[PDB]
PDB file of N, CA, C and O in Angstrom:
ATOM      1  N   UNK A   1       7.398  26.677   2.119  1.00 57.26           N
ATOM      2  CA  UNK A   1       6.239  26.161   2.929  1.00 57.26           C
ATOM      3  C   UNK A   1       5.247  27.253   3.143  1.00 57.26           C
ATOM      4  O   UNK A   1       5.579  28.206   3.865  1.00 57.26           O
ATOM      5  N   UNK A   2       3.992  27.029   2.663  1.00 56.81           N
ATOM      6  CA  UNK A   2       2.956  28.021   2.805  1.00 56.81           C
ATOM      7  C   UNK A   2       2.153  27.750   4.080  1.00 56.81           C
ATOM      8  O   UNK A   2       1.604  26.628   4.323  1.00 56.81           O
ATOM      9  N   UNK A   3       2.130  28.689   5.014  1.00 60.15           N
ATOM     10  CA  UNK A   3       1.381  28.604   6.289  1.00 60.15           C
ATOM     11  C   UNK A   3      -0.107  28.906   6.038  1.00 60.15           C
ATOM     12  O   UNK A   3      -0.417  30.040   5.624  1.00 60.15           O
ATOM     13  N   UNK A   4      -0.915  27.960   6.430  1.00 60.75           N
ATOM     14  CA  UNK A   4      -2.503  28.219   6.235  1.00 60.75           C
ATOM     15  C   UNK A   4      -3.134  28.077   7.646  1.00 60.75           C
ATOM     16  O   UNK A   4      -2.835  27.229   8.409  1.00 60.75           O
ATOM     17  N   UNK A   5      -3.987  29.082   7.841  1.00 59.96           N
ATOM     18  CA  UNK A   5      -4.663  29.158   9.125  1.00 59.96           C
ATOM     19  C   UNK A   5      -5.733  28.053   9.233  1.00 59.96           C
ATOM     20  O   UNK A   5      -6.038  27.585  10.356  1.00 59.96           O
ATOM     21  N   UNK A   6      -6.132  27.577   8.130  1.00 60.21           N
ATOM     22  CA  UNK A   6      -7.150  26.461   8.058  1.00 60.21           C
ATOM     23  C   UNK A   6      -6.479  25.135   8.403  1.00 60.21           C
ATOM     24  O   UNK A   6      -7.011  24.349   9.165  1.00 60.21           O
ATOM     25  N   UNK A   7      -5.272  24.882   7.887  1.00 61.09           N
ATOM     26  CA  UNK A   7      -4.438  23.756   8.124  1.00 61.09           C
ATOM     27  C   UNK A   7      -3.954  23.769   9.627  1.00 61.09           C
ATOM     28  O   UNK A   7      -4.181  22.812  10.366  1.00 61.09           O
ATOM     29  N   UNK A   8      -3.511  24.942   9.999  1.00 63.41           N
ATOM     30  CA  UNK A   8      -2.977  25.136  11.364  1.00 63.41           C
ATOM     31  C   UNK A   8      -4.119  24.767  12.363  1.00 63.41           C
ATOM     32  O   UNK A   8      -3.882  23.983  13.288  1.00 63.41           O
ATOM     33  N   UNK A   9      -5.289  25.383  12.093  1.00 62.07           N
ATOM     34  CA  UNK A   9      -6.404  25.028  12.984  1.00 62.07           C
ATOM     35  C   UNK A   9      -6.733  23.564  13.082  1.00 62.07           C
ATOM     36  O   UNK A   9      -6.940  23.040  14.126  1.00 62.07           O
ATOM     37  N   UNK A  10      -6.702  22.881  11.914  1.00 61.72           N
ATOM     38  CA  UNK A  10      -6.989  21.355  11.922  1.00 61.72           C
ATOM     39  C   UNK A  10      -5.953  20.744  12.807  1.00 61.72           C
ATOM     40  O   UNK A  10      -6.361  19.790  13.555  1.00 61.72           O
ATOM     41  N   UNK A  11      -4.751  21.091  12.738  1.00 63.36           N
ATOM     42  CA  UNK A  11      -3.648  20.530  13.539  1.00 63.36           C
ATOM     43  C   UNK A  11      -3.890  20.850  14.978  1.00 63.36           C
ATOM     44  O   UNK A  11      -3.502  20.046  15.860  1.00 63.36           O
ATOM     45  N   UNK A  12      -4.447  21.986  15.265  1.00 62.06           N
ATOM     46  CA  UNK A  12      -4.846  22.420  16.665  1.00 62.06           C
ATOM     47  C   UNK A  12      -5.943  21.647  17.180  1.00 62.06           C
ATOM     48  O   UNK A  12      -5.941  21.203  18.272  1.00 62.06           O
ATOM     49  N   UNK A  13      -7.076  21.486  16.281  1.00 59.96           N
ATOM     50  CA  UNK A  13      -8.260  20.846  16.747  1.00 59.96           C
ATOM     51  C   UNK A  13      -7.873  19.380  17.098  1.00 59.96           C
ATOM     52  O   UNK A  13      -8.504  18.829  17.985  1.00 59.96           O
ATOM     53  N   UNK A  14      -6.997  18.805  16.364  1.00 57.54           N
ATOM     54  CA  UNK A  14      -6.631  17.419  16.578  1.00 57.54           C
ATOM     55  C   UNK A  14      -5.608  17.259  17.690  1.00 57.54           C
ATOM     56  O   UNK A  14      -5.498  16.271  18.393  1.00 57.54           O
ATOM     57  N   UNK A  15      -4.884  18.365  18.037  1.00 60.34           N
ATOM     58  CA  UNK A  15      -3.910  18.369  19.109  1.00 60.34           C
ATOM     59  C   UNK A  15      -4.522  18.925  20.347  1.00 60.34           C
ATOM     60  O   UNK A  15      -3.851  19.285  21.344  1.00 60.34           O
ATOM     61  N   UNK A  16      -5.835  19.058  20.427  1.00 59.51           N
ATOM     62  CA  UNK A  16      -6.563  19.586  21.532  1.00 59.51           C
ATOM     63  C   UNK A  16      -6.500  21.035  21.701  1.00 59.51           C
ATOM     64  O   UNK A  16      -5.933  21.622  22.670  1.00 59.51           O
ATOM     65  N   UNK A  17      -7.257  21.775  20.755  1.00 59.58           N
ATOM     66  CA  UNK A  17      -7.224  23.217  20.757  1.00 59.58           C
ATOM     67  C   UNK A  17      -8.596  23.695  20.180  1.00 59.58           C
ATOM     68  O   UNK A  17      -9.358  22.865  19.598  1.00 59.58           O
ATOM     69  N   UNK A  18      -8.967  24.941  20.449  1.00 55.17           N
ATOM     70  CA  UNK A  18     -10.211  25.517  19.879  1.00 55.17           C
ATOM     71  C   UNK A  18     -10.062  26.112  18.534  1.00 55.17           C
ATOM     72  O   UNK A  18     -11.075  26.573  17.949  1.00 55.17           O
ATOM     73  N   UNK A  19      -8.924  26.131  17.975  1.00 54.81           N
ATOM     74  CA  UNK A  19      -8.677  26.719  16.585  1.00 54.81           C
ATOM     75  C   UNK A  19      -7.142  26.883  16.357  1.00 54.81           C
ATOM     76  O   UNK A  19      -6.348  26.459  17.104  1.00 54.81           O
ATOM     77  N   UNK A  20      -6.848  27.518  15.267  1.00 54.68           N
ATOM     78  CA  UNK A  20      -5.440  27.783  14.906  1.00 54.68           C
ATOM     79  C   UNK A  20      -5.245  28.711  13.689  1.00 54.68           C
ATOM     80  O   UNK A  20      -6.229  28.944  12.861  1.00 54.68           O
ATOM     81  N   UNK A  21      -4.165  29.366  13.618  1.00 54.88           N
ATOM     82  CA  UNK A  21      -3.928  30.373  12.473  1.00 54.88           C
ATOM     83  C   UNK A  21      -2.427  30.270  12.061  1.00 54.88           C
ATOM     84  O   UNK A  21      -1.698  29.503  12.507  1.00 54.88           O
ATOM     85  N   UNK A  22      -2.134  31.230  11.229  1.00 55.27           N
ATOM     86  CA  UNK A  22      -0.754  31.399  10.712  1.00 55.27           C
ATOM     87  C   UNK A  22      -0.359  32.804  10.644  1.00 55.27           C
ATOM     88  O   UNK A  22      -1.078  33.718  10.132  1.00 55.27           O
ATOM     89  N   UNK A  23       0.778  33.039  11.251  1.00 52.19           N
ATOM     90  CA  UNK A  23       1.418  34.422  11.369  1.00 52.19           C
ATOM     91  C   UNK A  23       2.378  34.626  10.134  1.00 52.19           C
ATOM     92  O   UNK A  23       2.210  33.993   9.164  1.00 52.19           O
ATOM     93  N   UNK A  24       3.463  35.379  10.385  1.00 51.20           N
ATOM     94  CA  UNK A  24       4.487  35.583   9.406  1.00 51.20           C
ATOM     95  C   UNK A  24       4.749  34.200   8.588  1.00 51.20           C
ATOM     96  O   UNK A  24       4.851  34.245   7.397  1.00 51.20           O
ATOM     97  N   UNK A  25       4.848  33.105   9.317  1.00 51.94           N
ATOM     98  CA  UNK A  25       5.143  31.801   8.796  1.00 51.94           C
ATOM     99  C   UNK A  25       5.105  30.782   9.872  1.00 51.94           C
ATOM    100  O   UNK A  25       5.908  29.766   9.849  1.00 51.94           O
ATOM    101  N   UNK A  26       4.329  30.937  10.937  1.00 51.74           N
ATOM    102  CA  UNK A  26       4.301  30.084  12.004  1.00 51.74           C
ATOM    103  C   UNK A  26       2.834  29.800  12.605  1.00 51.74           C
ATOM    104  O   UNK A  26       2.109  30.807  12.943  1.00 51.74           O
ATOM    105  N   UNK A  27       2.413  28.610  12.579  1.00 50.03           N
ATOM    106  CA  UNK A  27       1.039  28.194  13.047  1.00 50.03           C
ATOM    107  C   UNK A  27       0.932  28.316  14.548  1.00 50.03           C
ATOM    108  O   UNK A  27       1.754  27.916  15.309  1.00 50.03           O
ATOM    109  N   UNK A  28      -0.212  28.985  14.900  1.00 47.63           N
ATOM    110  CA  UNK A  28      -0.474  29.187  16.366  1.00 47.63           C
ATOM    111  C   UNK A  28      -1.838  28.506  16.592  1.00 47.63           C
ATOM    112  O   UNK A  28      -2.693  28.477  15.785  1.00 47.63           O
ATOM    113  N   UNK A  29      -1.931  28.062  17.823  1.00 43.47           N
ATOM    114  CA  UNK A  29      -3.174  27.382  18.294  1.00 43.47           C
ATOM    115  C   UNK A  29      -4.068  28.382  19.089  1.00 43.47           C
ATOM    116  O   UNK A  29      -3.575  29.194  19.833  1.00 43.47           O
ATOM    117  N   UNK A  30      -5.385  28.140  18.951  1.00 45.97           N
ATOM    118  CA  UNK A  30      -6.348  28.890  19.705  1.00 45.97           C
ATOM    119  C   UNK A  30      -6.837  28.193  20.962  1.00 45.97           C
ATOM    120  O   UNK A  30      -8.051  27.815  21.036  1.00 45.97           O
ATOM    121  N   UNK A  31      -5.951  27.913  21.880  1.00 45.36           N
ATOM    122  CA  UNK A  31      -6.217  27.261  23.102  1.00 45.36           C
ATOM    123  C   UNK A  31      -7.533  27.652  23.689  1.00 45.36           C
ATOM    124  O   UNK A  31      -8.449  26.783  23.867  1.00 45.36           O
TER     125      UNK A  31
END
């Protein structure tokens, strides 16, 4: 599974966030 900051962000924007990224292999949201 490839972690993408662009995909992560989209998941965060839809889940109520200001953005999102990807670390070692875990998506984080930009609350």
